[PDB]
Design a protein that fits this description.
It is found in: Cytoplasm; Nucleus. The modification Phosphothreonine is found at residue 13. It is a single chain. The protein is mainly alpha-helical and 67 residues long. It has one domain (1-67): Arc Repressor Mutant, subunit A, CATH 1.10.10. It is 51% helix and 0% strand. The longest helix has 12 residues, at 49-60. The radius of gyration is 13 Å and the shape is globular.
Amino acid sequence: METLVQARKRKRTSIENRVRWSLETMFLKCPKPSLQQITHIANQLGLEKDVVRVWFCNRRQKGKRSS
């Protein structure tokens, strides 16, 4: 109960499963998200730029170049 080292995916203190896919709808509006918009993305879900970059890495290669 009072432990913080056994999450399921990563964390839920400031990254609800809906917050991550909330980022998704914000990135599927334009294919040109500025790194400045990435700063507003962090303040948008209180996460670290490191988890927002790895999270957008998959959002970048979901199926644009399948071979």
